[PDB]
Design a binder for this molecule. Sequence first.
Ligand code: MG
Ligand code: MG
Length: 415
Amino acid sequence: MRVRIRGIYATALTYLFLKNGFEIVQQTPQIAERFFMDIIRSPADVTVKDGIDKGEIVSVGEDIYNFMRSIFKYSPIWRSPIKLYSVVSTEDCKFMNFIVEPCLSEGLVIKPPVEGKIILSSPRAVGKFAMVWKGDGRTFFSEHIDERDSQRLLSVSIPFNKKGYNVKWRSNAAMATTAELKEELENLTMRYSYNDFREQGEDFLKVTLSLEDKLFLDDIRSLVINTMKFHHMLKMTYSNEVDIEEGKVNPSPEKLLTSLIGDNMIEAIEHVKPNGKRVLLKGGTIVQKEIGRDYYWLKIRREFKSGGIYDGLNLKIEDGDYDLVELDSRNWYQIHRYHDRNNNLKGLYVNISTPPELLKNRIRYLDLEVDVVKVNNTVNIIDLEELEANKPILGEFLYKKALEIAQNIKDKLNE
Ligand SMILES: [Mg+2]
Ligand SMILES: [Mg+2]
């Protein structure tokens, strides 16, 4: 299969796709040079790029799920049951088990249901190179079409604009022969006029990368060009700063890591659920930290006001209650020590997760559902059934690893 790759993971991903037999196409000149390969100006069967959040990789086109699940063992992967750019029929503003927006009775899926919500637009006939529908008769271009390639495309779609068809050129169109393009618009306009959208959808998946797989990608990228530890994690906040440091004699991520939690304050903990939803949890003051060449550790103090129950502990939250949270880049867990205003220990909550990432004034981790709670000398592994519910997207390796950690923590808490 021919694959097109963009975004902060592109070098590491290019290595791994090559290593697994894919044809790389539409390389940038800088990718071509790094892999000593020719730029192939051919359409891609599948496109891999950053998600809306740079901590995600998305894939659109042919299904590569089984391949992605074997590269990324320690990351949730969601395969869309709904093909992107399919056309669906709606009732009561629902399609199957999903909400749609807007509430079109017939609509083109333009965003998959990552969290149970499908984004629609008015139907269009979609091929690999173009989308067509009825309108004024205008030609639109993907952002990723160079100007040198636009005029050829316009010459093809102008006739169809005259007929009242809007034409959206997709970036793959720039690599297609002119005869392919003409055939494409002939077929698309004909299918549109018959209201025929069968089999037009494209497969979609999203990898929510853990720090474990980001470090694996740092290692892979290291085989091609100079790469610091935490390179990809830092590329969520920094751009050229990371490359500058990687040109130095012994590159270290220490200063850029320190800058993220510069002022010893965490405004929020991003608790990422298996499905990708980022849940903001209360932050606090960094009372102690250690940032080295290849790891970081922090102790955060979180202040609580009256209100509610502490999850797992089943204890009421009182004014002046505080949490001492220990987290470490090498650890798949955070130890929360819950105290009252007079420093009395209320309980211990061990949050199980993928290794914590650093963002500007924020911590991020992929929560693994199972937790371990200790109150007095009661030590309980909780929410095993919620880890089970999330096994299809977590995959078996994260699932097994969260069971090992849980057992380990219980044994330690019981000593
Ligand atoms: Mg948890
Ligand atoms: Mg829970």
